[PDB]
Structure 1
């Protein structure tokens, strides 16, 4: 769609929309992030505070596989059950027949308690769990057991 551009509409107008006084020059302010402390400092301080300097401590050879730990909340905890058996599990809200959720094969590393699961007991297999999530599972009547 070169035909919908303003280059097509600027045909016949001298400056091509770039001005007669301050023309289109090559690099009137510098190239890239030039002068971010000198004449682009106002833009840096307004729109990107914290840009200059270093804060934290380094980590040589940091592998993100170590820190892989996707978080699953309790409101999404029941979506790990297939939709077919989900209704049966919700209706037959009994211990000693509780569904097993293995969040590790689901793809999650930690469980957080964002709240309001039903009162159906459930066996939750999680690598890590938060205090509130464990308390809410206990209140629902299920259990969270630690896996690896």
Structure 2
């Protein structure tokens, strides 16, 4: 919408808000990244500290599928089971049956452990598992088994 913008309020005012002494010429200072080391150093050092240089070794023909392993913490583990069954377990009426959660079917590969876990035995099948996640699941009565 051009009916309300600052260019309409400049009609009748010479220089259109760009100043008299500095006349808004074509390209003062250069185009793009010009002057990175010569006259734009103060900007490229107050901001963007680290623009220039080489760090680390290089990798030829990287395939990102080799490095696919999304992770899930332990405090969201109970959120995988549906709500209706979940409330039955949390209420505590089963007392003799345990759920088996398959992380791969939900799209996860590594089970990290960050929060707390209620005292209900569970069975987790994961490709990877952390040491603290193994300990926390073990103290709740459950067991974790690798599945690949």
Give TM-score scaled by structure 2 length.
0.90
Runs of 4+ in 1 over 3 A off after TM superposition: 91-96
1:23 Cα deviation after fit: 2.1
Does the 8 A contact of 1:94 with 1:120 survive in 2? no
Larger Rg: 2
d(CA) in 2 for partners of 1:142, 1:96: 13
Does the 8 A contact of 1:89 with 1:99 survive in 2? no
1:86 Cα deviation after fit: 0.9
1:136 Cα deviation after fit: 0.8
1:4 Cα deviation after fit: 2.3
**Greater shift after overlay, 16-25 or 117-126?**
16-25
Alpha-carbon displacement from aligned partner over 1:97-119 (angstroms, at most 9, x marks no partner): 22111111111121111111211
Does the 8 A contact of 1:137 with 1:144 survive in 2? yes
Structure 1: stretches of 5+ with no match in the other structure: none
Residue correspondences, number: 148
Whose helix fraction is larger, Structure 1's or Structure 2's?
Answer: 1
Structure 2: stretches of 5+ with no match in the other structure: none
d(CA) in 2 for partners of 1:144, 1:13: 76
What SS class does the counterpart of residue 125 from structure 1 fall into?
strand
Give TM-score scaled by structure 1 length.
0.90
Does the 8 A contact of 1:94 with 1:121 survive in 2? no
1:1-148 correspondence to structure 2 within 5 Å? 1-92=1-92, 97-148=97-148
RMSD, matched Cα: 1.8
1:22 Cα deviation after fit: 1.7
